[PDB]
From a paper:
Protein tyrosine phosphatase 1B (PTP1B) is a negative regulator of leptin signaling in the hypothalamus, where it dephosphorylates the active site of leptin receptor–associated Janus kinase 2 and decreases signal transducer and activator of transcription 3 (STAT3) phosphorylation and transcription of the anorectic neuropeptide, pro-opiomelanocortin (POMC). As such, there has been substantial interest in the development of PTP1B inhibitors for the treatment of obesity. Focusing on the variants in and near the ordered catalytic domain, we ascribed structural mechanisms to their functional effects using in vitro enzyme activity assays, room-temperature X-ray crystallography, and local hydrogen–deuterium exchange mass spectrometry. By combining these complementary structural biology experiments for multiple variants, we characterize an inherent allosteric network in PTP1B that differs from previously reported allosteric inhibitor–driven mechanisms mediated by catalytic loop motions.
Some of these variants are located near known allosteric sites: for example, D245G and Q78R are adjacent to the conformationally bistable loop 16, which is known to be allosterically linked to the bistable, dynamic, catalytically essential WPD loop in the active site. Somewhat surprisingly, I19V also decreased catalysis in vitro, despite having no statistically significant effects in cells. These mutations decrease kcat but do not change Km, consistent with allosteric effects from their locations distal from the active site. For Q78R, the difference features include some similar regions, such as the β sheet and P loop, but are more limited, perhaps because of the lower resolution. By contrast, Q78R decreases exchange for an adjacent buried β strand and the active-site P loop, which houses the strictly conserved catalytic cysteine (C215). These regions thus form a conduit from the mutation site to the catalytic center, consistent with significant functional effects for Q78R in vitro and in cells. Based on specialized electron density maps that reveal low-occupancy binding events and protein responses in atomic detail, we identified one of these fragments that allosterically shifts the conformation of the catalytic WPD loop from open to closed.
Author numbering: 2 to 285
């Protein structure tokens, strides 16, 4: 059990220490495509790069680069695409990736402006009657409906491939209350948001992998995936205290660097898994 392990780290304020053990043990793989000079303006942060083995490739010949990694969790039968918040020049690339990977959902965990600065481009329409057209990738994007709630917004979007004239419906899940500094006081709203994504079908294997992002696509995005996968492994497994959060994290870091950026995000991640265990070990 890891409810027990939480007590001891918290009691002895050892979070920052646990957290460094993870940094040291974490994998390091080449990030060569990302560091090519022709890709410098496709990267929001120069220290956050996809490894070459797990990077998502666009099907354009000129340049196939987008800062995005596929995270494949074999036992849980979950895949995720973690990417950065799009830049003004990568909005068309982003929706091209969503198109090519047959994703059904986009999870966004940041606000467009945080701490007085822009953390993401406004990459979806805000009014039904003003659609967006991405000329470089030949895609049209329309807002269909928008359901605003206390701590999250869900939007139905229509994506049309202008070339082939086909269209798909994409769900945009936008967590809007992650605090500017720190992590939420309680996992309650976050877990409720996670179960809403689950309920929508967007994580299910008939679909492409879900696209998850924040500003760099490693911090809050990492917390989302780590919690989903852990809670899944605790349903699948004979022994629901045989799930080691730290091992799961280290296995996802084989696929994208830096996932979970602070010891506070680590603490919060234990916290949401522990609390989520209640609502899937029968206690509806
Ligand atoms: Mg209106």
């Amino acid at each position: 059990e890891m409810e027990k392990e939480f007590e001891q780290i918290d009691k002895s304020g050892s979070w920052a220490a646990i957290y460094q053990d993870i940094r040291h043990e974490a994998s390091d793989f080449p990030c060569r495509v990302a560091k090519l000079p022709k890709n410098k303006n496709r990267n929001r942060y120069r220290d956050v790069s996809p490894f070459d083995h797990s990077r998502i490739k666009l099907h354009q010949e000129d340049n196939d680069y987008i800062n995005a990694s596929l995270i494949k969790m074999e036992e849980a039968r979950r895949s995720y695409i973690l990417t950065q918040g799009p830049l003004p020049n990568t909005c068309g690339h982003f929706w091209e990736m969503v198109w090519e990977q047959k994703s059904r959902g986009v999870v966004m965990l940041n606000r467009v402006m945080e701490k007085g600065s822009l953390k993401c481009a406004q990459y979806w329409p805000q009014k039904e009657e003003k659609e967006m057209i991405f000329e470089d990738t030949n895609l049209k994007l329309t807002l269909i409906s928008e359901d605003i709630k206390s701590y999250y917004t869900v939007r139905q979007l229509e994506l049309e491939n202008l070339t082939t004239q086909e269209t798909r419906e994409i769900l945009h899940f936008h967590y809007t209350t992650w605090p500017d500094f720190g992590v939420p006081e309680s996992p309650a709203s976050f877990l409720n948001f996670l179960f809403k994504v689950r309920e929508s079908g967007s994580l299910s294997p008939e679909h492409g992998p879900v696209v998850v992002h924040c500003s760099a696509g490693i911090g809050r995005s990492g917390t989302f995936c780590l919690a989903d996968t852990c809670l899944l492994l605790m349903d699948k497994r004979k022994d629901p205290s045989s799930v080691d959060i730290k091992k799961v994290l280290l296995e996802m870091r084989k696929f994208r660097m830096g996932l979970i950026q602070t010891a506070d995000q680590l603490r919060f991640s234990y916290l949401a898994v522990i609390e989520g265990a209640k609502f899937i070990m029968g206690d509806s």
